[PDB]
């Protein structure tokens, strides 16, 4: 039996709680700045908020985070176990949506490496979630976890340019096992 732990990470507390060399930033102020103009950047390293680089992703707003800086290994002592790996990641986006609109977001990793977000209420990627998985077995130390929002550019009149103005924080529910 594994020690089955649920961890909640707020991306605003990660981005604003960055070291002053890499440059901390407000999440909701930089999302309002990145969406309103064409593109830009906010942050440094793997804890950043930039646009897309590839083809047909240049209108997508991508929020990257690093598992090594979330410091999940310090939440419990190392005498319990060192096999600390992800069971499941879900993500809640507290926003203000339209009358019949949805949220489009892709939770990626550097197949079970991607995850689509559709409503943002403890949103696993699955239709029904059955433990009988994406990101399962990724260690909680190394990696980079990107949340990409397609159609997120207001100069390019994207449909998600209005929902991201109402977005104040991004919440990840990391379920991981210690064994």
């Amino acid at each position: 039996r594994a020690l089955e732990v649920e961890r909640t990470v707020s991306l605003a507390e990660v981005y604003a709680g960055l070291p002053k060399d890499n440059g901390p930033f407000s999440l909701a102020q930089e999302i309002d700045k990145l969406v309103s103009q064409g593109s830009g950047s906010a942050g440094s390293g793997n804890n950043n908020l930039a646009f897309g680089a590839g083809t047909d992703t240049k209108t997508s707003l991508q929020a990257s985070v690093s598992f090594a800086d979330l410091k999940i290994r310090e939440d419990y002592p190392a005498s319990l176990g060192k096999i600390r790996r992800i069971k499941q990641i879900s993500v809640t986006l507290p926003a203000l949506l339209g009358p019949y609109q949805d949220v489009q977001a892709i939770l990626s990793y550097g197949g079970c490496e991607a995850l689509a977000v559709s409503h943002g209420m403890n949103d696993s990627g699955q239709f029904q979630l059955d433990f009988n998985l994406p990101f399962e077995g990724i260690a909680i130390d190394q990696g980079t976890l990107t949340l990409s929002f397609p159609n997120a550019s207001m100069p390019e009149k994207g449909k998600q340019a209005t929902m991201l103005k109402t977005l104040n924080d991004i919440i990840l529910h990391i379920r991981y096992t210690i064994k």
Partner: peptide, 11 residues
């Protein structure tokens, strides 16, 4: 009347 905005976390 359909409300134009709703707080998007209905659970």
């Amino acid at each position: 009347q359909l409300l134009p905005i709703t707080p998007a976390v209905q659970d």
